[PDB]
Each structure stands twice: as structure tokens, then as C-alpha cells.
Amino acid sequence: GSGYGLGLSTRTQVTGYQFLARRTAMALTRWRVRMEIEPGRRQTLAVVASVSAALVICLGALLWSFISPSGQLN
Amino acid sequence: GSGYGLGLSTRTQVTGYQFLARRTAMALTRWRVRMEIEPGRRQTLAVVASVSAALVICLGALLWSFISPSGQLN
Amino acid sequence: VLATGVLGWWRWHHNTWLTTIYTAVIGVLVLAVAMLLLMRAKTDADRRVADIMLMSAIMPVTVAAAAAPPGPVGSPQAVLGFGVLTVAAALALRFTGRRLGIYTTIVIIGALTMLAALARMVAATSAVTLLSSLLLICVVAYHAAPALSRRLAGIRLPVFPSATSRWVFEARPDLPTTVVVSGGSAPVLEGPSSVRDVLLQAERARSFLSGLLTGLGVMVVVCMTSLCDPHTGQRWLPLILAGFTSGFLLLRGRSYVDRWQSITLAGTAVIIAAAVCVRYALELSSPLAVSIVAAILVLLPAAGMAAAAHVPHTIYSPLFRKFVEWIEYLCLMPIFPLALWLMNVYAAIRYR
Amino acid sequence: WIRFIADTERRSQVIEHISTAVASDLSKRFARIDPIVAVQVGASMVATGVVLATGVLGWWRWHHNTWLTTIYTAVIGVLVLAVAMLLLMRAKTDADRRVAD
Amino acid sequence: LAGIRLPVFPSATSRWVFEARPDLPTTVVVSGGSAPVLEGPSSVRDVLLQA
Amino acid sequence: DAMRAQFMLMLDMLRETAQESADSMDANYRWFHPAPNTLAAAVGSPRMWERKPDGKDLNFGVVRVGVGMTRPEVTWGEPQNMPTDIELEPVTGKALQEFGRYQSVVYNLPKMVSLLVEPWYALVGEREQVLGLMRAIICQLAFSHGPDHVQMIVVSSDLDQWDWVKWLPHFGDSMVYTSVREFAAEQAELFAGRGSFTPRHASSSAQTPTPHTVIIADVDDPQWEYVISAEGVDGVTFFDLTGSSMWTDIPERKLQFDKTGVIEALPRDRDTWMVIDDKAWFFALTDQVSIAEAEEFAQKLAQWRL
Known part of the structure; x- marks a missing residue:
């Protein structure tokens, strides 16, 4: 057949599928496909922003560690 | 429907409404709508400028307290 | 189930093999009856009967295994118990293909609990840390819920370059499938096999999602109400985290239009506040505390009823509708930065 | 009973694209949330809320003798009763009565 | 506070109908001059008191 | 993504337009050709013996045989400036x-x-x-057309199966035979007098004589060769219930029944009835009635006269 197996694929095919996943995902929760605005994108991006904020803060703490460590006694 | 409730809205709608508000606020104050110049915005930005200058001086003072700490009588 | 209860209470106070050994036969017996009922069952009423019995057999089987390890009850018993529970529920679901909801709920709490106890067993990690991590996994699971539910239901998305060929508009259409009924033996055809599955895949998809939301709901309330504590230092830190989490869930509901799906989200947000309020009154009991808790516990749901009655018949300008939307994103953003603070990770790194 | 039973024969309906097909079908076999149900939910939450408050207030009296428990509960009782009374006078339909009851 | 209502937006889900059936006019009365008179649509007459 | 989204949306509004036209055809065809079990109740209604032969009625001489697939009344226009095969975008490609x-x-x-x-x-x-399909065809003819327009004949040895025919008026005369030798003496003396078969159409219907003859063959007698080798006569139509080699030698006139009751035949045009392919393919799901059901229907019809 066609479409089965692990054949090659292209970058235009990768975005094409992600469009169908987002569109079908809202069809299960909102029962309409109009997609006037795309809230699924925003809600996911918000988590990515949150994680990034967590990563940024912990790197800052490591930078602090080299500027004034614990072993400087006496 | 007819617009009841908390449904989502787009950026084109947000400025669209805000423009209808400025034009009506002028009508109650000057009784004309020709609006060759729009003094309503101008008077508002001057306040925003005032708030911004005050906050910068607050941050400067807060930052100075960390650069060379001190204290006060109680 | 009541029998397994007293046997459990005994095992909770005595270190004898009685419960594991004596319960095993009890489970096997009910399971045997259930197997025959499933074979002999043909009508819908029988299936209801068969399902109830089968569901009852998993409980004794679960506690029996959990009670198998010797010595004081603890970390390893939990791993064994929730473990077989997870496999049993999943296994029952796969072959039964019925009661999708209730079985799915069991699978998730088991799986996450299995991963929780396993960590406590392999490493001396505190409950504080072990609970905060469960909170984060559940937060991201809500965003995954609509997608994860797509796979289990069997929806497939085709993408290929049109078979490396130009289109054929006059292609011979697919053959319609014929269907029959036991009494109404005269057959009738309804349509292409490819299209009928969608009408069935969709009904199945709705059930997996409803369960997945319920299972996650239980976990967030149990974890959150455990993190906040009235004696632990910096009392306000774990409490503020409970506030934003509640806000996020409460607003997220309006992405779901289904009746029971939406109420479970709203309900999940309200019950977390109520549950913390009770815990904060019993311990560290005092006149101000009980006076305060009693007020919050009655004003909060009251305002809710007020909002529910008036919002559907009033008009709001775009600048306000756009403002409530942004609260949701503002609520999600602080969860990760705070959870790590409560877990002392930043202090741990700053002092390496 | 002698009865007339109509013909059930009619055309079939097909939608090929998976997302549109899921949305169409899923909207005809289930019920969506509506304002009528929202109010009943609101009433149910307040009822559950007050029984929890009286519970904790009672738990204090079982260990303390002050008037606090009776004083605090009396005002809540009067307020809840006052609202219920006001609603019963305004109810027009059975839906409203379920809220009031 | 005076209740001035800015027009509600169509939310981008329907086309405009250029000429729907016109809105019904409203009647007014006076006791001494018992003969009633009519003057306009309800939506317009209110603004003159609203301002 | 915005372009893809708008293309999908525009495609679904065309779908609704197609579905609305489809509903009109369902209502229209059923209104002229109901299922056999419902005709019994309709006997008193004015819909009985309604069909006319006078050229404008395109449904004359048409009989319902079952259910299946058909081409809609829509006419699709091909898309302009179609991009070449290597140039087509994947999502919108499969969609169209x-x-x-x-x-x-x-x-x-x-x-x-x-x-x-x-x-x-x-x-x-x-x-x-x-036998099931034949009983269905007979009653459909009997309900929509009057005896002044249709007459029927049966030649069969298994008379216990054709007993119910007694009540229908269309089997009258100014009538079941045991063999071709018997049929040849009584009936063939009348029908062999003129013509040979010639396929007609609606406009031509105004010219053919009013009484059309339907003949049912259930004996497998080799004597039938005389009229069959002469390619019949106009105003007659034969149904071979035996499947004899002399009738079965033309695929364009052969209907094959599967174990599931599905009929296969050569495809024919909805407007011209012309054969469009030489290979047999799915045609319709068979509709059928029992002997009791047929006699019940015949008795109800037997109550009426001009």
C-alpha cells in the first residue's frame, strides 16, 4: 500500500500534520472547527514560557555560586 | 447569539471599541466630533509619563539601598 | 469489599500471613464466578451484571499482592499493590472494551502512585519533594489530555503525496456495508466502512477524555492539600501556590463545552480551596482561625452562584472580554518558578 | 392496541474529512452546558458550603463554652433563610423551584 | 453611569442584511389632549433622555 | 496556516450546498417509488393507479427493484490553473x-x-x-398501473407457488400455464401475430398501444427458442426464473445474486438506461415479500374497479 511504513518525509509534510492535529484537537473539546482564534497554541506556549523562566532563574543561581562559594572559611 | 457573556475577542475588535469610546467622550465634553486634533489621548499620555518618571526614581532608590545598605532610627 | 476491609485492618495491626493467604482464595472465587458470567452473558442486562462482578474481583487481587511482603507495612507493599492494580485495570479494559471511563481513572492514579512510592523506596526523598513533582506532572498532563485521548481512541491522520500521482475524480466509489438485526433479519445497507468507524471512534474518544480529567482531578486535590501546612515555616509560600493552581483550572473550563466535563473542571477548582480551609482550621485551632475559615467557606460559593445567574444575560465590552482571557496565561506562568522554590532547588544550587 | 407505524427508510449521510465529521456527530448525541444548569450547580455548591461551616463551628463548642457558636450560626441561618424566602416569592417555573428548594 | 450603550460587535459569524424589515414605531399620550401621537423607534427616543 | 485554514472552511460550505440538493432527491424519488411493504396501506389513497403513458410522464414502465448507489444531480466544474503534480501542497491535495x-x-x-x-x-x-424479487416486481406494477395499461402471464409447473396470483385483476382476460406446448396453443396464437422487440423512451411511449404484457417463464422448456431466437416482440417482456442457457447467453440481460442477496449486473445510465461498461459490478440490495404478504396485498387491491 501507500502511507504505511517508515518511508521518507519532508519538512512541508511535518507542518501539514501539525495543522491537522491542532484542528482535530479542538473538535473534541469545543465541537466546532471555525478556529476564529487558536487557543491551543497560546495555552501550550504559556507552559513553555513558564519552564523557560524556571531555567533562566536556576542558571542565575549557578552564576552566583562561582562569585561567592561556601568553602571560603577562616 | 447576540454578544452576551464572556466570549473571546480579537485585536481588531479591541481597538475598534476603544475608538468609539474616545469619540463619545469628546462628544460629552466639546459637543463636536470633527476631531482635527485628539486632545483626549494627549492629556492621558502626560499622566503616563508622570507615573513612569516616579517609578524610575523608586527603582533607583531601591537599588541604592542594596549597593550600600544602612538603617533608620525606630 | 467489606471483607477485604476488615482483613486489611487486621494486616495493618498484625504481621501474620493470614490476610494475603486468606484473601487470595476469596479473589480467585469471585473471579471464577465472573469468568462464567461473562461467557454465559448475552443480553445488555447480563453485561451489567457481569461487569459489576468483574470490577469487584480486582480489589481482593490488588490487596492480596500488596500484603505479600513481610514485616512492617510500608514502601514496597504500596509499589506491589498499585502496580498490579494498574496492570489489572488496563488488562480488564483492553479485552472488555466496555466501561472505558471508570477503568481509565483507576489506571492513572495507580501509575502515578506507583512512580511516587518507587522513588521513596529507591531513594530517601522527602514527601515535600515527592508531592511537588506530582503536581507539575499533572499540570502538563492537562495540556496533553486532548491529544493523548486521540491516540487511545484510534483516530488516524493520513498524509502522503497523493501516491506520487495526479488526481482521479471518477474513481470507482467504495462498496457500502450491509447490516442486519437479530429480530429484523432483513438486511439494510448504511454506507462506506471508512466513514462508519468515525461515528464510532468519536463516541469512544469522549469517554477516554472524561476519565483522564477525573483521574487528574483527584491527584491535584490530594497533592495540594498535603503540601500546604499550618505549622511549617513560611506558611504563605505553599498557600499562594494553591491559589494560582485553582485559578488556572477554574478558567480552563470554558474550553470544554460538555456538561459533565465542564462541571468536573469547575468542581475541581472549588473543592481544592474548601479542602485546604478545613485542614487549616482543625490543626492549630483558635478563635480567629475558626472565625475566618467559617466566613471564606460560605462567601466563596455564594459569589459563584451570584455570577452564574447574572453573566448569561449581560453585555460586556471587548476590552473586558480580552482582559479575562489574559488571566489564564498569567496564572499558568508562576507554577514552575514557585514549585522549585518550595523544593529549595535554587538554594540547593546557590550553595551547590 | 391497533396502530399506524410510519416508514423508516431515508438516505444516508457521509462526511469524509475526519475533523469536521467528529464535530458534527459529537454535537447531536450529547448535551452541552447551559445557563439553566449553571444556576442549579451554583445553588448546590452553597448548600454544601454552609453544612461544612456549621460542622467546624460545632467542633469548637464541643471543647469551648463561649457564645461564639450560637451567635455566628444564628446570623448565617437568618441570612440563608432570608434569601430562600425572597426566592420563593420570585420563582415562576419548576426550574426556579428546584433552585429555591 | 448614565447607561450609554456602545454598539455590540457581530463576532465575525454572519453576513450583513442590508434591509431587514424596519423597526416598529412607538406611540405617546397626553391626558388633556387625549389624542395620541407617534414619534419614533424606542432605541432612538431613549438617547435624548440619556444625554 | 491561515491560507490552509481558510481553504478548508470554504470547502465545507460547498459540502452543505451539496447535502441540501441531496435531500431534495431523497424526498422526490421516494414519493414516486415507495418500498413494497408500505403499498398495502396506500391502496385507498389517490396515489394508486396514478401513472400515465402520455409522453410527459417519464416514470411510466419503470419498476423499483431495491436499494443502492446513484449519481447525484450536481454538476462539478473542474478547478482552474491546476498546479503541476510536483507543485501540489500535501494537506489540500488529499482534501480535494x-x-x-x-x-x-x-x-x-x-x-x-x-x-x-x-x-x-x-x-x-x-x-x-x-421468486422473492418477482413477487415484489408484480405488486409494484400492480399498485402504480391500472389494468387498462398492464396485463400479466405466468408459465410454471410449481403451481403451489403461483396460487396467490388468483386475486390480482391484471391477470384477467376479456391464466397460468403448465408448459410451453399449452402456452403456445392459447397465448402465442395472439402474440406471435406481430412485431419484434425495439427499445423505447418516454416520448415514444405516447405511440405504443396501451396494454403492455409481462410474461413469467418457470418451465425450462426448449420450445421457447421460436420467439427467443426471433428476438421477441414489441409490447412484451419475459422474466426467466429458471436460468436456462437460451436466456442466459446475454450479460446485458443477466442479473446475478450473491450469497448475501446482493445483485450484480452491468452498469446502466440513469437518464438513458444504456450500458456503460462490459464488466458486471454491484447493483442493488434485493427487496422481497413472502407468499402470505403477496396474497394479503392482492386481496386489498381486489376490492376496487374502474
Whole structure:
């Protein structure tokens, strides 16, 4: 057949599928496909922003560690 | 429907409404709508400028307290 | 189930093999009856009967295994118990293909609990840390819920370059499938096999999602109400985290239009506040505390009823509708930065 | 009973694209949330809320003798009763009565 | 506070109908001059008191 | 993504337009050709003996045989400036292709056969399938057309199966035979007098004589060769219930029944009834009535006269 197996694929095919996943995902929760605005994108991006904020803060703490460590006694 | 409730809205709608508000606020104050110049915005930005200058001086003072700490009588 | 209860209470106070050994036969017996009922069952009423019995057999089987390890009850018993529970529920679901909801709920709490106890067993990690991590996994699971539910239901998305060929508009259409009924033996055809599955895949998809939301709901309330504590230092830190989490869930509901799906989200947000309020009154009991808790516990749901009655018949300008939307994103953003603070990770790194 | 039973024969309906097909079908076999149900939910939450408050207030009296428990509960009782009374006078339909009851 | 209502937006889900059936006019009365008179649509007459 | 989204949305509004036209056809075809079990109740209604032969009525001589696939009344215009095969975007490509495959046919519609198109119709399969469809065809003819327009004849040895025929008026005369030798003496003396078969159409219907003859063959007698080798006569139509080699030698007149009751035949045009392919393919799901059901229907019809 066609479409089965692990054949090659292209970058235009990768975005094409992600469009169908987002569109079908809202069809299960909102029962309409109009997609006037795309809230699924925003809600996911918000988590990515949150994680990034967590990563940024912990790197800052490591930078602090080299500027004034614990072993400087006496 | 007819617009009841908390449904989502787009950026084109947000400025669209805000423009209808400025034009009506002028009508109650000057009784004309020709609006060759729009003094309503101008008077508002001057306040925003005032708030911004005050906050910068607050941050400067807060930052100075960390650069060379001190204290006060109680 | 009541029998397994007293046997459990005994095992909770005595270190004898009685419960594991004596319960095993009890489970096997009910399971045997259930197997025959499933074979002999043909009508819908029988299936209801068969399902109830089968569901009852998993409980004794679960506690029996959990009670198998010797010595004081603890970390390893939990791993064994929730473990077989997870496999049993999943296994029952796969072959039964019925009661999708209730079985799915069991699978998730088991799986996450299995991963929780396993960590406590392999490493001396505190409950504080072990609970905060469960909170984060559940937060991201809500965003995954609509997608994860797509796979289990069997929806497939085709993408290929049109078979490396130009289109054929006059292609011979697919053959319609014929269907029959036991009494109404005269057959009738309804349509292409490819299209009928969608009408069935969709009904199945709705059930997996409803369960997945319920299972996650239980976990967030149990974890959150455990993190906040009235004696632990910096009392306000774990409490503020409970506030934003509640806000996020409460607003997220309006992405779901289904009746029971939406109420479970709203309900999940309200019950977390109520549950913390009770815990904060019993311990560290005092006149101000009980006076305060009693007020919050009655004003909060009251305002809710007020909002529910008036919002559907009033008009709001775009600048306000756009403002409530942004609260949701503002609520999600602080969860990760705070959870790590409560877990002392930043202090741990700053002092390496 | 002698009865007339109509013909059930009619055309079939097909939608090929998976997302549109899921949305169409899923909207005809289930019920969506509506304002009528929202109010009943609101009433149910307040009822559950007050029984929890009286519970904790009672738990204090079982260990303390002050008037606090009776004083605090009396005002809540009067307020809840006052609202219920006001609603019963305004109810027009059975839906409203379920809220009031 | 005076209740001035800015027009509600169509939310981008329907086309405009250029000429729907016109809105019904409203009647007014006076006791001494018992003969009633009519003057306009309800939506317009209110603004003159609203301002 | 915005362009893809808008393209999908525009495609669904066309779908609604197609579905609305589809509903009109369902209502229209059923209104002229109901299912056999419902005709009994309609006997008193004015819909009985309604059909006319006078050229404008295109449904004259048409009989419902079952349910199956049909081509809708829509006419699709091909897309302008079609991009070359290597230039097509993947998402919209399959969409326009599958749209074209499914929306080009509508499922579960009533299929029909016209007596004005063939000298005979060979029924091949098990006895129950063959007799069931014949009983259905007979009652459909009997409800829509009056005795001043249709007359029927049966030649069979298994008279216990054709007993119910007694009540219908269309089997009267100014009538069941045991063998061709018997049929040849009484009936063939009248019919052999003139003509040979000639396929007709609606406009031509105004010229053919009013009484059309339907003949049922259930004896397998080799003596039938005389009229069959002469390619019949106009105003007659034969149904072979036996499947004899002399009738079964033309695929264009052979209807094959599967184990599931599905009929296969060569495809024919909805507007011209002309054969469009030389390979047999799915045609319709068989509709059938029992002997008791047929006699019940005949008794209700037997109560009325001009």
C-alpha cells in the first residue's frame, strides 16, 4: 500500500500534520472547527514560557555560586 | 447569539471599541466630533509619563539601598 | 469489599500471613464466578451484571499482592499493590472494551502512585519533594489530555503525496456495508466502512477524555492539600501556590463545552480551596482561625452562584472580554518558578 | 392496541474529512452546558458550603463554652433563610423551584 | 453611569442584511389632549433622555 | 496556516450546498417509488393507479427493484490553473481528491428497472431469491398501473407457488400455464401475430398501444427458442426464473445474486438506461415479500374497479 511504513518525509509534510492535529484537537473539546482564534497554541506556549523562566532563574543561581562559594572559611 | 457573556475577542475588535469610546467622550465634553486634533489621548499620555518618571526614581532608590545598605532610627 | 476491609485492618495491626493467604482464595472465587458470567452473558442486562462482578474481583487481587511482603507495612507493599492494580485495570479494559471511563481513572492514579512510592523506596526523598513533582506532572498532563485521548481512541491522520500521482475524480466509489438485526433479519445497507468507524471512534474518544480529567482531578486535590501546612515555616509560600493552581483550572473550563466535563473542571477548582480551609482550621485551632475559615467557606460559593445567574444575560465590552482571557496565561506562568522554590532547588544550587 | 407505524427508510449521510465529521456527530448525541444548569450547580455548591461551616463551628463548642457558636450560626441561618424566602416569592417555573428548594 | 450603550460587535459569524424589515414605531399620550401621537423607534427616543 | 485554514472552511460550505440538493432527491424519488411493504396501506389513497403513458410522464414502465448507489444531480466544474503534480501542497491535495471521490455519489437510494429497455431479464440464483424479487416486481406494477395499461402471464409447473396470483385483476382476460406446448396453443396464437422487440423512451411511449404484457417463464422448456431466437416482440417482456442457457447467453440481460442477496449486473445510465461498461459490478440490495404478504396485498387491491 501507500502511507504505511517508515518511508521518507519532508519538512512541508511535518507542518501539514501539525495543522491537522491542532484542528482535530479542538473538535473534541469545543465541537466546532471555525478556529476564529487558536487557543491551543497560546495555552501550550504559556507552559513553555513558564519552564523557560524556571531555567533562566536556576542558571542565575549557578552564576552566583562561582562569585561567592561556601568553602571560603577562616 | 447576540454578544452576551464572556466570549473571546480579537485585536481588531479591541481597538475598534476603544475608538468609539474616545469619540463619545469628546462628544460629552466639546459637543463636536470633527476631531482635527485628539486632545483626549494627549492629556492621558502626560499622566503616563508622570507615573513612569516616579517609578524610575523608586527603582533607583531601591537599588541604592542594596549597593550600600544602612538603617533608620525606630 | 467489606471483607477485604476488615482483613486489611487486621494486616495493618498484625504481621501474620493470614490476610494475603486468606484473601487470595476469596479473589480467585469471585473471579471464577465472573469468568462464567461473562461467557454465559448475552443480553445488555447480563453485561451489567457481569461487569459489576468483574470490577469487584480486582480489589481482593490488588490487596492480596500488596500484603505479600513481610514485616512492617510500608514502601514496597504500596509499589506491589498499585502496580498490579494498574496492570489489572488496563488488562480488564483492553479485552472488555466496555466501561472505558471508570477503568481509565483507576489506571492513572495507580501509575502515578506507583512512580511516587518507587522513588521513596529507591531513594530517601522527602514527601515535600515527592508531592511537588506530582503536581507539575499533572499540570502538563492537562495540556496533553486532548491529544493523548486521540491516540487511545484510534483516530488516524493520513498524509502522503497523493501516491506520487495526479488526481482521479471518477474513481470507482467504495462498496457500502450491509447490516442486519437479530429480530429484523432483513438486511439494510448504511454506507462506506471508512466513514462508519468515525461515528464510532468519536463516541469512544469522549469517554477516554472524561476519565483522564477525573483521574487528574483527584491527584491535584490530594497533592495540594498535603503540601500546604499550618505549622511549617513560611506558611504563605505553599498557600499562594494553591491559589494560582485553582485559578488556572477554574478558567480552563470554558474550553470544554460538555456538561459533565465542564462541571468536573469547575468542581475541581472549588473543592481544592474548601479542602485546604478545613485542614487549616482543625490543626492549630483558635478563635480567629475558626472565625475566618467559617466566613471564606460560605462567601466563596455564594459569589459563584451570584455570577452564574447574572453573566448569561449581560453585555460586556471587548476590552473586558480580552482582559479575562489574559488571566489564564498569567496564572499558568508562576507554577514552575514557585514549585522549585518550595523544593529549595535554587538554594540547593546557590550553595551547590 | 391497533396502530399506524410510519416508514423508516431515508438516505444516508457521509462526511469524509475526519475533523469536521467528529464535530458534527459529537454535537447531536450529547448535551452541552447551559445557563439553566449553571444556576442549579451554583445553588448546590452553597448548600454544601454552609453544612461544612456549621460542622467546624460545632467542633469548637464541643471543647469551648463561649457564645461564639450560637451567635455566628444564628446570623448565617437568618441570612440563608432570608434569601430562600425572597426566592420563593420570585420563582415562576419548576426550574426556579428546584433552585429555591 | 448614565447607561450609554456602545454598539455590540457581530463576532465575525454572519453576513450583513442590508434591509431587514424596519423597526416598529412607538406611540405617546397626553391626558388633556387625549389624542395620541407617534414619534419614533424606542432605541432612538431613549438617547435624548440619556444625554 | 491561515491560507490552509481558510481553504478548508470554504470547502465545507460547498459540502452543505451539496447535502441540501441531496435531500431534495431523497424526498422526490421516494414519493414516486415507495418500498413494497408500505403499498398495502396506500391502496385507498389517490396515489394508486396514478401513472400515465402520455409522453410527459417519464416514470411510466419503470419498476423499483431495491436499494443502492446513484449519481447525484450536481454538476462539478473542474478547478482552474491546476498546479503541476510536483507543485501540489500535501494537506489540500488529499482534501480535494477525497472530496471528489465521496461527494460524487449518494448512498441508499431506490434502484429501478425499465420494461421498455430489454426483451428479457434473466434471474440467476437460488429459488427463494428469484421468486422473492418477482413477487415484489408484480405488486409494484400492480399498485402504480391500472389494468387498462398492464396485463400479466405466468408459465410454471410449481403451481403451489403461483396460487396467490388468483386475486390480482391484471391477470384477467376479456391464466397460468403448465408448459410451453399449452402456452403456445392459447397465448402465442395472439402474440406471435406481430412485431419484434425495439427499445423505447418516454416520448415514444405516447405511440405504443396501451396494454403492455409481462410474461413469467418457470418451465425450462426448449420450445421457447421460436420467439427467443426471433428476438421477441414489441409490447412484451419475459422474466426467466429458471436460468436456462437460451436466456442466459446475454450479460446485458443477466442479473446475478450473491450469497448475501446482493445483485450484480452491468452498469446502466440513469437518464438513458444504456450500458456503460462490459464488466458486471454491484447493483442493488434485493427487496422481497413472502407468499402470505403477496396474497394479503392482492386481496386489498381486489376490492376496487374502474
